[PDB]
Design a protein around this ligand. Structure first.
Ligand SMILES: C/C(=C\COP(=O)(O)C(Cl)(Cl)P(=O)(O)O)CO
Length: 187
């Protein structure tokens, strides 16, 4: 609605491209670095320090330490996906639960129709329609991370008044083998 339109006018549109050096080896990062898909088997890649070696995650190339930013992600009909932001210093080696206290502010979909916010404990979301494009608002100084349906502007979830102390990266996670990719909408 009009509030979402006000916010998109205030917040700076971010041009997010995926960083292949961060992507778990089971992930396929597209050549234009806008899309991510899951491979049948892990790729033969180094275990460089930037790479998630357990979680099926990939980061954007640029992080945020200030300001108001937003980007939109086409999830389409994909039956499983989680997106949001995470701190630069999240645990990338070995499993960690993706939670705000561990530096992840994310939400998404499992099993086709189970929407969750990845809070601790996880919160189930009641969405009136399944989103096909999802917008992410980041307001660094106030500490707000918000998710919205990018087509009709309706609300999905707000993380409210977080105290950020690190740079923040867009983060993307996909677990399933299925033909629909995740694609970032360009700024
Ligand atoms: C197997 C993987 C994620 C499953 O995540 P996970 O076991 O941490 C969970 Cl089931 Cl706790 P989540 O979906 O609630 O985060 C690889 O990224």
């Amino acid at each position: 609605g009009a509030y979402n339109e006000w916010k998109k006018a205030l917040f700076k549109p971010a041009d997010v491209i995926l960083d292949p050096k961060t992507a778990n080896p089971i992930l396929l990062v597209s050549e234009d670095q806008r899309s991510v898909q899951r491979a049948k088997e892990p790729q033969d890649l180094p275990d460089n320090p930037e790479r998630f070696n357990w979680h099926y995650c990939v980061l954007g190339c640029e992080s945020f330490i200030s300001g108001r930013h937003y980007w939109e992600v086409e999830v389409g009909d994909r039956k499983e996906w989680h997106i949001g932001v995470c701190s630069k210093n999240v645990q990338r080696k070995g499993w960690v639960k993706m939670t705000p206290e561990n530096g992840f502010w994310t939400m998404g979909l499992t099993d086709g129709n189970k929407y969750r916010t990845l809070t601790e404990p996880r919160t189930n979301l009641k969405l009136p329609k399944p989103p096909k494009k999802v917008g992410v608002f980041l307001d660094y100084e106030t500490g707000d991370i918000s998710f919205y349906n990018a087509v009709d502007g309706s609300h999905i979830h707000t993380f409210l008044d977080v105290s950020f102390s690190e740079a923040l990266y867009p983060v993307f996670r996909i677990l399933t083998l299925e033909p629909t990719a995740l694609t970032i909408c360009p700024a």
